[PDB]
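Teaching note: in complex prediction, the entire set of molecules is handled at once rather than each chain in isolation. The prompt given to students was simply: 'Predict the structure of this complex.' The entities are:
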Amino acid sequence: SKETLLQSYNKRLKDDIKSIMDNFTEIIKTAKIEDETQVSRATQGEQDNYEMHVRAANIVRAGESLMKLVSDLKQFLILNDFPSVNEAIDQRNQQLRTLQEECDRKLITLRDEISIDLYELEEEYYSSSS
Amino acid sequence: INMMEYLLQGSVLDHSLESLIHRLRGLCDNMEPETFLDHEMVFLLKGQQASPFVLRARRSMDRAGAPWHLRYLGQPEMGDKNRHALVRNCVDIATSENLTDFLMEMGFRMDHEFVAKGHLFRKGIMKIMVYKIFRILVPGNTDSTEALSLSYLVELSVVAPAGQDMVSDDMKNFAEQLKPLVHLEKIDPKR
Amino acid sequence: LANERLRALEDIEREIGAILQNAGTVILELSKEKTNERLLDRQAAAFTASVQHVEAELSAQIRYLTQVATGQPHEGSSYSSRKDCQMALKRVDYARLKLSDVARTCEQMLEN
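The expected output is the structure of the full assembly:
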């Protein structure tokens, strides 16, 4: 339903913000240097490098998901935000009415001028001697 | 035959009103709103019975040449046939403009006047009226008036034949399409 | 119409700004010497302010969308006015073609 879709959007937003914050905080925490005990410097360093790269990838993925959320929200607004549909419909209607009225005024003035010319031509043609 | 009126009623605070109207312009038929302005006055006949007869008379002040309107509303049916709407018996009568004078001869006396100013939409058979009730003081004058409350009233009404089910369910669905903005419900006329 | 949509465009740009502020903060932390630790604090506050107001804008817009959603397909339209405008324009075009024909017969008469 509409409620269900809006809830789902809320869930996605909360999840994305939470993920960006958590990944950044975890990267900062690993960035701490600590004294080693039973971790074998080389292994500890490679594991830390992998963790940082994976977390950065996760942050980028969360940003892409936030872009997807913004796109979905834009689609919902363009499709069913009733006020803006009403202002678009009304503006379209008023513009088309003004164009119709301009066309009809042009046609009516054309008819009157053509009618006066027709009167002159009728007098000339019917009163021709031949 | 005897036609019945199905009513759902509610109210809406005025500062949210426009959103309601915009919502209604989506859901109701492809029309501009109507902006009715009516004068309503209630006559009663103090007969022998404990219940005096009641009659409602409306003159549409805004539109010239609109016929006056009489309405008799029967007492609501206690039967649970349509459980979700006020089901009443309605007799609605278009009339000439000497009506009040005629009703003064019939034994009827006035009770109260009120202006009602608002908008009017429809959806199929349904009639949505969103109006503000204006108390008249200085009882002859129609200009000396004061708003009764801050809220507008919203009525969803269907006049149709006696019985005739699957009507109140459609009114339920159309009320539920408004349910964040308005709460429409069958409110009993008692208290 | 341009208002809420431009808000969505701004939130797009600020998501980019959030990612760039994350990247700039770890850029400054990766430096051998990072003297501008005050600027590190400024970039950190910039990052958190970006994330917070992105959350604020999107939460506000989901709330506003919750207020004006109906699940119904909006039975309004603007078709009839477009139809009448098209008929008016085709009336004008018909009159133009006929005036061309009358002017052509007048040129044939005056031409001799």
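Point out the following to students. The radius of gyration of chain B is 17 Å. Chain B has one domain: 3-177.
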